[PDB]
Structures are given as structure tokens and as C-alpha cells.
Design a protein around this nucleic acid. Structure first.
Ligand SMILES: [Mg+2]
Ligand SMILES: [Mg+2]
Ligand SMILES: [Mg+2]
Ligand SMILES: [Mg+2]
Ligand SMILES: [Mg+2]
Ligand SMILES: [Mg+2]
Ligand SMILES: [Mg+2]
Ligand SMILES: [Mg+2]
Ligand SMILES: [Mg+2]
Ligand SMILES: [Zn+2]
Lengths: 204, 68, 103
RNA sequence: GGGCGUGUGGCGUAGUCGGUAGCGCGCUCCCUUAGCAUGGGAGAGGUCUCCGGUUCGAUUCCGGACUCGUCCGCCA
RNA sequence: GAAGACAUUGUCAGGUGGGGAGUUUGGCUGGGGCGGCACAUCUGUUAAACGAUAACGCAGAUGUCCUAAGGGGGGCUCAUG
RNA sequence: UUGACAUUGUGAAGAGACAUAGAGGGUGUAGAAUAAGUGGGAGCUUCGGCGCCAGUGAAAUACCACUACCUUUAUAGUUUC
């Protein structure tokens, strides 16, 4: 266990100089080689909300489009001929549906900057259309990783204390045990400092 | 140290299993050599026992008890 | 020769006992260990004076080695071995032959 | 068997992830000179040994194969 | 006087070491050597219409190649004029 | 012949290496800057300076939460000359 409640018990309530949204990343090292097989992975399970300003561009245009608009936040259709070239920049997660299987015409010219191409890491053609909306909108790193490491995700909003971080942590930091080898250290998450922009610095 | 095989120029005249010259070990102890030399010095006496007293890189030192 | 990376063949794994899918790799021998009894005995025989105490092969005549396929059952992870005939060139990547095309 | 390197025009080679890549001899063709030689230019000449991956993009970085060269190693 | 915890000496370890030691340095074969392989094999013939059958007899071949050039099915018919 | 250990005791400096804290920096492309990463989004801020939706650049540019690499340097710990 990294911490039961120690050193992060109340150091998010008494520091209120900014009541605005407080998102703090969690960055740590585990060095690896040049290969691209077992790095940025691990979509976790997490109950804290996000209240982000992202966009979910689901492509499904049957009359449950408003059901998709209340369970999600964007409805798109397959008139992809001059729709987007340089628009999609602000995103934390995306989602699609049954009709996005043969969209290779619009896949190559614009799904290259952020590299959200429909590879094996980006499985948007999802049939279960009611479960990955209110709980998976929370931030989680499912991307392509660099030459060394990509490990950064927000564990809690500054308005949310550790009453859920006592339980999301030990179901969360068991990160890469399921696919990666043990070249990594055993629970290599160590020294961390909680500071979105205004937190103090604490050390193990 | 060891017992260098006392052959001229290291030549043994036989099979390779017996070609060794340098790393050969005397089957008796340095203490036994010490007692033998002391007994030869005093052949009128009888060697009872001996014990180690000191050593350096070149020499080991023993004291030999003898009885008349 | 060209051999595919997958093969559906018999699996005697006491829960399959039938044709299942197998992943095919090439067998590599593996590092000769110390503390194997033959190695321990050989080192004991070699130590000391007397030179080389076992034969050392010189009159090599083969130009090939037999290729052994190691087959992993996809269900029970049971491993099988099968040897092929002598070949100078071996490949597991399947680039299938095409018939009515240009040279 | 392990470790360390090499492969580029007809030839000999240099090379930054922004290069079908700069050079020097071969060929042509101009220029210079009254003219010949010498000199100066330009034009053709390389699927960068081969195949995949990485990268926004590789001669270049990584993985595999072929050939060559050092050092070490050796019980069927 | 010099020299000094270095030399030296001891024990292991790597290099060098025909100065020295021990040993080895195929067979068939119209002598042996050189050549060849008739040394493990395959087709036809020698071979005398069962089988067997020699020569450094004759004409050749083998140490590979193929995820199809293996297996099953269907359709079709080739060289040549 | 070379190394290690022993013979083998007593003192000084100097130079590294590793950890430990700090320090700034970086090519072509162009947006708004010699652009080496990273997740989030507009604000904390002396300025409305820097960025937001604005363009474009492989990449967004306040902000580091970690420093991807350095030695150009400073102190005390271990170790090697
Ligand atoms: Mg002696
Ligand atoms: Mg003798
Ligand atoms: Mg022994
Ligand atoms: Mg020995
Ligand atoms: Mg001799
Ligand atoms: Mg003979
Ligand atoms: Mg017959
Ligand atoms: Mg056939
Ligand atoms: Mg038929
Ligand atoms: Zn099985």
C-alpha cells in the first residue's frame, strides 16, 4: 500500500486560494527500450467524475440521436467529404458506433495529428451503448507512448477529497502487471507531489 | 609453498598426466618436515610433539618438544 | 521451405485430446548448464594435468540441421515437437505462392 | 557460439531523421587559346546489400537475413 | 652508505613458450605414389528370361527441393500437324 | 611476463567516478518567438505582458507534476587512481 490516508488526508481543502477546477497529474519513471508493445495501455476502473469540456463525437444517426445526446455530447453523420481537416484538437476521449467501420476515406487525412486512428489501441466501434459514458469520461491514458515512458493521469479533482482515493488507488496503481514484464519495479509509483497549480509539496 | 618437482628443465619423460612440475603438493606437512629436521639434529632425543608459533610469506615457524 | 505460423493438429493435453489450434515456432536448443552431471564430471576430469581428456569432433560432413517445430496449443499451452526434413533455407513467415503471375 | 564493425554510380568513396545523396576518376558536350595540350563548366550516371518496424518524415534509428573482417570461446 | 613498505618471496589466475615432452599424421588400388571413389547409396545395362552375381566395367544420378510440388473434391485434355 | 591476495606497518596532498542538492540550454518547418518532451485548459498574474477559442507549425507557446540528455559548476557521503 502506498498510503492508507497518510500525507494526503486533508491537504486539498485548507489551501483554497482558487476554487476553480484543479486537475493534478501523476508523473513517475519506469524506463524501457525502443519497442512499442507494452507501454501506454491499461484503461482502469474509476468512480470519480471529470466535469471536463471534452467532446464525444459518436456517429449514429437513428432516432435515438437525442438519447445519444443525453448520454453523450456530440452526434455526427457520414457526410465525411469535406467535414474536418483541422478541427479536432480538444479531446480527452472519443466514441463511435456501427457505421464507422469503412471510414478509411476520412481516416487517413485528419486522424494523424493527435493520432486517434482506429487501430487496436482505439476501439470506437462499440456495441454496448449505455455503460461507457458517465464513468469512463473521467481521464485515463489510452494512447501511444514515447521512446521512454508516458504515465500521467489525474486521480482526483481538487473539489474531491480522498474519500474515494482511499479505494480507487489500490485498484488503480496495479497498472502494467497484466501485460508487461517485470523489467519494471514492483509498484514503481513512488515519490509524488500533489500540485495542480497551487498544492504544496510532500515527499515519502 | 609447493614442492617443485626436482627434474632438470621441467622434463619428465612420460605421459601428459605426469608432465606437471609446479603445482604439485608434498604429502606431508611443513610441521612434519620441521620435526624430521629437528630429530636429525638431536638424534639422541625423541620427538614428542610440535606446535606452530609464527609465520611470514617465506617461513613457517614451529617449536618442537623433545624428551631425553 | 515455407511453413505457416499456425497449425490445427492433435493435442494430447488430457483436456483437449483432439485437434486444436497451435502456434508454430522454431526450436532453439538452450544454454548448456553447469551442474548438469555430465558437465560436472567433465570439469572434474579436465582439471589438473593431462590435457584434453575427451574427444573433440573435427570431421564435420553435414551442411544442414533438421528443423524442429515447437507447437503451442492455444487452449492448454501444451507443447509438441515435430521434425522436418533437411533444408538449406527455412521460413515461418507465410508469403504464399502465386501461380498465374509474372516473373 | 558470443561480442565488435563494413556494404552507396562503370570504379574508388564522403554522408546530420528534412537528400535518389556531395565528390574524385570514366563518358559526352560546351568554354578558354591564333591553335594543340593543360585547365574551367554543364549533362547524363546510385530502387543507398535485402526485407519489416519506429518516426510527422529514415541512407542514417531499431529488429531479421546475405557477404566480409577483428577478438574470444570449443567433450556429442 | 643505498633502498623501502615498493622490490623480493609464496599461492592462484591470464598471456607467451618446437627451448623441451608425449603422440598422431585413413582405406581401396593390375606395386606404391599422383589421380579417382568403384568407401553410404539410386536408375538402366553388363547379368547368361525365378532370385543371386565381379572388375578403377558402360551410360548416368544422391547429401537436395516443396504449405504445396502434401491431402480431398470438381471441371477439363496434352505434344504435334 | 601481467594481475590479485599474502609478506605489510605509519602519514599527506591532488585528480576522478557514483550517489546527494542546485544551475541554465537546445535548428531547418512557422504560428506569435533558434521549438527538447509530458498530461489539463484559460487564467493565477506589477503589466492585460504570456497563452484560450485565432492562424499555422510533426508538436502548442502562462503554468510543471516530472525532467526526457548535458557539465559549464558548487557542498558533503562511498569508492578508484
Ligand atoms: Mg617447497
Ligand atoms: Mg617418467
Ligand atoms: Mg580439484
Ligand atoms: Mg589446471
Ligand atoms: Mg616434438
Ligand atoms: Mg594402401
Ligand atoms: Mg535375374
Ligand atoms: Mg503431386
Ligand atoms: Mg479429377
Ligand atoms: Zn491442448
Amino acid at each position: 500500500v502506498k498510503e492508507l490516508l497518510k500525507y494526503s488526508n486533508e491537504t486539498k481543502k485548507r489551501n483554497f486560494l482558487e476554487t476553480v477546477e484543479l486537475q493534478v497529474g501523476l508523473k513517475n519513471y519506469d524506463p524501457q527500450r525502443d519497442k512499442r508493445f507494452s507501454g501506454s495501455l491499461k484503461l482502469p476502473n474509476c468512480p470519480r467524475p471529470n466535469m471536463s469540456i471534452c467532446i464525444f463525437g459518436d456517429a449514429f444517426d437513428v432516432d435515438r440521436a437525442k438519447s445519444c445526446g443525453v448520454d453523450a455530447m456530440s452526434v455526427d453523420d457520414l457526410k465525411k467529404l469535406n467535414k474536418n481537416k483541422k478541427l479536432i484538437k480538444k479531446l480527452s476521449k472519443k466514441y463511435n458506433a456501427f457505421i464507422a467501420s469503412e471510414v478509411l476515406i476520412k481516416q487517413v487525412p485528419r486522424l494523424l495529428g493527435p493520432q486517434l486512428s482506429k487501430a487496436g489501441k482505439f476501439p470506437t466501434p462499440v456495441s454496448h451503448n449505455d455503460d461507457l459514458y458517465g464513468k469512463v469520461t473521467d481521464v485515463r491514458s489510452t494512447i501511444k507512448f514515447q521512446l521512454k515512458k508516458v504515465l500521467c493521469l489525474a486521480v482526483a479533482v481538487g473539489n474531491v477529497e480522498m474519500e474515494e482515493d482511499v479505494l480507487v488507488n489500490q485498484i488503480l496503481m496495479s497498472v502494467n502487471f497484466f501485460v508487461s514484464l517485470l523489467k519494471k519495479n514492483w509498484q514503481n509509483v513512488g515519490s509524488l507531489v500533489v500540485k495542480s497549480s497551487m498544492g504544496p509539496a510532500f515527499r515519502l | 609453498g609447493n614442492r617443485k618437482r626436482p627434474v632438470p628443465k621441467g622434463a619428465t619423460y612420460g605421459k601428459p598426466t605426469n608432465q606437471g612440475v609446479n603445482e604439485l603438493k608434498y604429502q606431508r606437512s611443513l610441521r612434519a618436515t620441521a620435526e624430521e629436521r629437528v630429530g636429525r639434529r638431536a638424534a639422541n632425543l625423541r620427538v614428542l610433539n610440535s606446535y606452530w608459533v609464527n609465520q611470514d610469506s617465506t617461513y613457517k615457524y614451529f617449536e618442537v618438544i623433545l624428551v631425553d | 521451405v515455407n511453413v505457416p505460423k499456425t497449425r490445427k493438429t492433435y493435442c494430447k493435453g488430457k483436456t483437449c485430446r483432439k485437434h486444436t489450434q497451435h502456434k508454430v515456432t522454431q526450436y532453439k536448443a538452450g544454454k548448456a548448464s553447469l551442474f548438469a552431471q555430465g558437465k560436472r564430471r567433465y570439469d572434474r576430469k579436465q582439471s589438473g594435468f593431462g590435457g584434453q581428456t575427451k574427444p573433440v569432433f573435427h570431421k564435420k560432413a553435414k551442411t544442414t540441421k533438421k528443423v524442429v517445430l515447437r507447437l503451442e496449443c492455444v487452449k492448454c499451452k501444451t507443447r509438441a515437437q515435430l521434425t522436418l526434413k533437411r533444408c538449406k533455407h527455412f521460413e515461418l513467415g507465410g508469403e504464399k505462392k502465386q501461380k498465374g503471375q509474372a516473373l
